[PDB]
Amino acid sequence: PDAEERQTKLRLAYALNAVIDRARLSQAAAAARLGINQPKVSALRNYKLEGFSVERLMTLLNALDQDVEIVIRKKPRSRAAARISVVAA
Amino acid sequence: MPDAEERQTKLRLAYALNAVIDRARLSQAAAAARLGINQPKVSALRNYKLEGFSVERLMTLLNALDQDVEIVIRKKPRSRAAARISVVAA
Lengths: 89, 90
Hints:
The structure is a homodimer.
Chain A: H1 2-22, H2 27-34, H3 38-45, H4 54-63, E1 66-74, E2 84-88
GO molecular function (chain A): DNA binding
Organism (chain A): Rhodopseudomonas palustris (strain ATCC BAA-98 / CGA009)
Protein name (chain A): HigA2-like helix-turn-helix domain-containing protein
């Protein structure tokens, strides 16, 4: 579970960083748009995620106009473990 | 915004977890054993006292109850003012 959570954070941060890339925003513009510290943006850009919660990453996605829908489903009968995944739509 | 949105997400995730416990017809003791959390933590969950749980932890507990958690990231619709976090039990 400790592993899954860092993996979830890394995937949300990848999505976040990709949106920032597309938007062609500098770190200064990104900081402002995201409503975070310039120290906080540098960490994000460097995948230093120790001070970002999964919730925070999702709300930063929202700040860049990305909806986040968390869908909860029973695992297939024909699968042994349930998982958290991060998907683009 | 800011803590209010987080509280809302947690409540929705907690509803989804409680609903899974409900359908599985698990006792509090059985849910404690299944989730590997102590009975007082199970009691908190049933009572929506969620200060002790992270969003991340609620997703982990959902997985322990054999629920997949798919986090879908979408560009918001043009005529909605702000993007949001939603929770759907599918």
